[PDB]
Amino acid sequence: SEFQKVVVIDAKGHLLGRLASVVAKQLLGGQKVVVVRCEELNISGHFFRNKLKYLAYLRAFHFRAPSRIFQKAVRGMLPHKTARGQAALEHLQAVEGIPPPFDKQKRVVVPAALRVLRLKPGRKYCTVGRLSSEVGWKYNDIVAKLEERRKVKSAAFYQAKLAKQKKIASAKEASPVNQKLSQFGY
Amino acid sequence: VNIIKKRTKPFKRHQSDRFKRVGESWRKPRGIDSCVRRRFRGTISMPKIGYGNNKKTRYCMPNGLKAFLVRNVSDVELLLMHNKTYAAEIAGNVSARKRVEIVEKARALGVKVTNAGAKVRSQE
Amino acid sequence: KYYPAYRENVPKKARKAVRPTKLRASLAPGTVCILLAGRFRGKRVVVLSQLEDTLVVTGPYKVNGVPIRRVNHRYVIATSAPKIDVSGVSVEKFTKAYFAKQKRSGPVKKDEAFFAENAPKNALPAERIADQKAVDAKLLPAIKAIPNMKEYLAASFALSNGDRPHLMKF
Amino acid sequence: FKRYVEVGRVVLVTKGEYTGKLAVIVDIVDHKRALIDSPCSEFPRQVIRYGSVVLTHIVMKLPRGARSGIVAKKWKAQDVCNKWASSAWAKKLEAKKVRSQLNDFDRFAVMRLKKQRREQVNVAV
Amino acid sequence: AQGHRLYVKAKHLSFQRSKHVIHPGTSIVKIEGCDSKEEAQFYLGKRVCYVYKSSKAVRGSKIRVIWGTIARPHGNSGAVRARFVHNLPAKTFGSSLRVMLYPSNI
RNA sequence: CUGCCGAAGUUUCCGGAUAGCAGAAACUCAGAUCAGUUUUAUGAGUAUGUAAAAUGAGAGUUUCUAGUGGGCCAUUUUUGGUAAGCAGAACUGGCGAUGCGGGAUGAACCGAACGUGAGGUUAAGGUGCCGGAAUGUACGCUC
RNA sequence: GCAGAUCUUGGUGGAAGUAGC
RNA sequence: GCGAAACCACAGCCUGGGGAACGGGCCAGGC
């Protein structure tokens, strides 16, 4: 449906293949896509299954960061040999965690890629950041530490916004104009 | 009545752009193992009678007229009755002494000239 | 000069007779409609009468400043706003010749404006303003009777974010 | 949980030509299909799949396999109508339905209306 | 603020192509906000344009427009087929477009 | 340079004379015949040939005159095989003179056989992304 | 009426300012 | 400082598959 000039996507609980396919199609549509929390990406299958899949890949440059793992999946779904697919890649920014510039921006999700809406209950799935922890990535511990720090600050902002929202909500019914002409569904 | 051209690009000889010794003028490819003769995908087109243009609009210039080569005033007078179908075209070897008299004669006859301003200047 | 000098192939007798245009059901006189194209795009105006093909339309002069103008019926969105009383204003004077562009004429002799370019200028006659001053006189009480009509026609229609023209009703 | 597939639960149809209507489960054909009915005349007794419906929180006392006439009488007796409407779910849906019909003039009157309500800002005044 | 925007935003996706053959005469246009072929029927026949800019200015204006018209829907997802007066360049894939509300039948 | 016709790639006797295939001319015919046709029935042994209903096409010549006078693959039939494979013949078409959509790609596979174009609709194959097209519906199976 | 004939004659290149003297 | 000649369709990263070699051109991947 409606689009935006730049899109920030929260990759928590999103399947790797499903999200990458939607992102790759959006990149070829000229949109600018920024994917945050790339280390919480989920892949269907046992963590043993993906460990050997990555270990087989280890046996070019074998990138270990979860963000570069996601970029590899997106890269394969683009015509990177041509200029059109080259420009699409430069319009994508995959990062782990939520950096400050995208910290205070709305983060949308893709229901077609969400694990809960796409994976059978009880199925074993592995987290990309957790999977990448035993392949060479050594920043998982600190990335989590900033994440809780960001969550505390984000929660404090939400309480301030919620407390402020209570003021307009209380004053919403105070004005008689709301009740007088609420026949329009508003 | 509008002139429709089935094609505007010329038919170049195959491999004419790789060699200077091979001219651009169209030559039918006689090679049996040639991809151009067998008309594969990506191979160039060849002159076929299907490309032939409408008989009514054949030989017609984009302005709707047919060129008529003129070497003197006597040639241009022939177009007295056919001035809405033909345009006078003075030959390249006709001197400027005769080009001016052809253009003045073609003006009274109501005949378009395709190259009326050649080898002359004006003096208002 | 008169006997045909050429073959002069006469056109074959065509069988395309001119029948009146069928306007839309919702393009009735007195409908508040949005102009889609032109210099007054987005302006809401009131339909006075339907011409042979176009709509003789006008926005009230003091409301949105849209003079009595022709608009093509394909370039108009007819909103479902309440109708305006237009039976009280005569519209017989609005013909094809009334809106027709004044003939480009003037026997300008050689030089002066022909060469020196001391050209004249155009100006709308008071006759057009006189007829215009009458229509808002017979229309302003009608739009004032119902609420928000004066403010409605003053505003200009626009599309906001998340507005789907196919879904939302006009 | 709060919602279970049981006889007498009021469900809301969300797919097909009966989208937005209300119905009550009468029989449990299978874990994928169920038989429903409604007191409304335009809604016939039919078998529908659970993918085309969402279960509301309203549960009403029905014997298994009740006919449409008995269901309609029980529906009126248990006052199911205007009880679902009392929920904020129906009010949100009804507001959405009324909003969809709104034309341009009503939208213009709304903008002026919400413009007046906005300037109140009587917080900390 | 609030601009004018008497049009609908749209994107140029690709040409009418098979796997290996392209037809630049027809372009596939995604009118964003339209999600099915039935919804696409509203926008059939509307005037679509590609507004771009060139560094050289003509008549004191640096904006150039290629006009087109939506012909028919394409697929089940509301994408439409548009034919322009000049075939759209291949480099305008993913570029924005403007779909007017005229000609109108509402 | 363009356009229109257009094979054969092999019977048979034996480098050949034939023939076949493809054209030219002159003849007589549409109330005459013909067919990689299907029948009916007679017989004969589910098939078989013959004779006489449907369907389609106007048919039969005579004369002389270019080229071919390799095969590959595939289908079916096949006889023995025999580490197992396979080999051997025969049967029949396609390619060999032929581009096009699909098949990742590919000459044998699936569709389709070609003047230059606009529009429409499909075949085979497809609709997550590369890629045009449902991250369609309804059941299940699979970790 | 030419693109071919390890074609004929003439001109001219890269190898190369190289091998080298 | 003086100064050739052989040779010269064009080119010049791999990995596979591509049945006829196919890798140097083709198809999917890396560079």
UniProtKB/Swiss-Prot annotation, chain B:
GO cellular component: cytosol; cytosolic large ribosomal subunit; nucleus; preribosome
Species assigned in the record: Schizosaccharomyces pombe (strain 972 / ATCC 24843) (Fission yeast)
InterPro entries listed in its UniProt record: Ribosomal_eL32, Ribosomal_eL32_CS, Ribosomal_eL32_sf
Name recorded for this polypeptide: Large ribosomal subunit protein eL32A
One Pfam family recorded for the sequence: Ribosomal_L32e
Similarity comment: Belongs to the eukaryotic ribosomal protein eL32 family.
Swiss-Prot/TrEMBL keywords: Cytoplasm, Nucleus, Phosphoprotein, Ribonucleoprotein, Ribosomal protein
A GO term for molecular function: structural constituent of ribosome
Subcellular location: Cytoplasm; Nucleus
Signal peptide residues on this chain, from the entry's feature table: none
One GO BP annotation of this record: cytoplasmic translation
Positions of post-translational Phosphoserine modification: 74
Subunit structure: Component of the large ribosomal subunit (LSU). Mature yeast ribosomes consist of a small (40S) and a large (60S) subunit. The 40S small subunit contains 1 molecule of ribosomal RNA (18S rRNA) and at least 33 different proteins. The large 60S subunit contains 3 rRNA molecules (25S, 5.8S and 5S rRNA) and at least 46 different proteins.
Organism domain of life: Eukaryota
Record lineage: Eukaryota, Fungi, Dikarya, Ascomycota, Taphrinomycotina
Additional note from the record: There are 2 genes for eL32 in S.pombe.
Curated annotation (Swiss-Prot), chain C:
KW Nucleus (keyword) present: yes
Predominant place of localization: cytoplasm
Annotated compartments: Cytoplasm; Nucleus; Nucleus, Nucleolus
GO molecular function: RNA binding; structural constituent of ribosome
InterPro entries (alphabetical): 60S_ribosomal_eL6, Rib_uL2_dom2, Ribosomal_eL6_CS, Ribosomal_eL6_KOW, Translation_prot_SH3-like_sf
GO terms classed as biological process: cytoplasmic translation; ribosome biogenesis
Ribosomal protein is among the record's keywords: yes
Keywords: Cytoplasm, Nucleus, Phosphoprotein, Ribonucleoprotein, Ribosomal protein
GO cellular component, one term: cytosol
Modified residues (Phosphoserine): 80, 90
Known partners and oligomeric status: Component of the large ribosomal subunit (LSU). Mature yeast ribosomes consist of a small (40S) and a large (60S) subunit. The 40S small subunit contains 1 molecule of ribosomal RNA (18S rRNA) and at least 33 different proteins. The large 60S subunit contains 3 rRNA molecules (25S, 5.8S and 5S rRNA) and at least 46 different proteins.
Purpose of the protein: Component of the ribosome, a large ribonucleoprotein complex responsible for the synthesis of proteins in the cell. The small ribosomal subunit (SSU) binds messenger RNAs (mRNAs) and translates the encoded message by selecting cognate aminoacyl-transfer RNA (tRNA) molecules. The large subunit (LSU) contains the ribosomal catalytic site termed the peptidyl transferase center (PTC), which catalyzes the formation of peptide bonds, thereby polymerizing the amino acids delivered by tRNAs into a polypeptide chain.
PANTHER family, per the entry: 60S RIBOSOMAL PROTEIN L6, LARGE RIBOSOMAL SUBUNIT PROTEIN EL6
Gene name linked to the record: rpl6
Swiss-Prot record, chain D:
GO biological process per UniProt: cytoplasmic translation; ribosomal large subunit biogenesis
Superkingdom per UniProt: Eukaryota
SUPFAM superfamilies: Translation proteins SH3-like domain (SSF50104)
Keyword Plastid among record annotations: no
Keyword terms of this UniProt record: Cytoplasm, Nucleus, Ribonucleoprotein, Ribosomal protein
GO function terms (MF aspect): RNA binding; structural constituent of ribosome
Family: Belongs to the eukaryotic ribosomal protein eL14 family.
PANTHER family documented for this protein: 60S RIBOSOMAL PROTEIN L14, LARGE RIBOSOMAL SUBUNIT PROTEIN EL14
Name of the protein this chain belongs to: Large ribosomal subunit protein eL14
UniProt organism field: Schizosaccharomyces pombe (strain 972 / ATCC 24843)
Swiss-Prot record, chain E:
GO MF, any single term: structural constituent of ribosome
Keywords: Cytoplasm, Phosphoprotein, Ribonucleoprotein, Ribosomal protein
Annotated positions of the Phosphoserine modification: 96
UniProt KW Nucleus keyword: no
Cellular component, GO annotation: cytosolic large ribosomal subunit; preribosome
One GO term of the biological process aspect: cytoplasmic translation
PROSITE patterns linked: RIBOSOMAL_L35AE
One Pfam family linked to the record: Ribosomal_L35Ae
Predominant subcellular localization, coarse grouping: cytoplasm
InterPro entries, A to Z: Ribosomal_eL33, Ribosomal_eL33_CS, Ribosomal_eL33_sf, Transl_B-barrel_sf
Location of the protein in the cell: Cytoplasm
Assembly description: Component of the large ribosomal subunit (LSU). Mature yeast ribosomes consist of a small (40S) and a large (60S) subunit. The 40S small subunit contains 1 molecule of ribosomal RNA (18S rRNA) and at least 33 different proteins. The large 60S subunit contains 3 rRNA molecules (25S, 5.8S and 5S rRNA) and at least 46 different proteins.
Function: Component of the ribosome, a large ribonucleoprotein complex responsible for the synthesis of proteins in the cell. The small ribosomal subunit (SSU) binds messenger RNAs (mRNAs) and translates the encoded message by selecting cognate aminoacyl-transfer RNA (tRNA) molecules. The large subunit (LSU) contains the ribosomal catalytic site termed the peptidyl transferase center (PTC), which catalyzes the formation of peptide bonds, thereby polymerizing the amino acids delivered by tRNAs into a polypeptide chain.
Misc note: There are 2 genes for eL33 in S.pombe.
Family: Belongs to the eukaryotic ribosomal protein eL33 family.
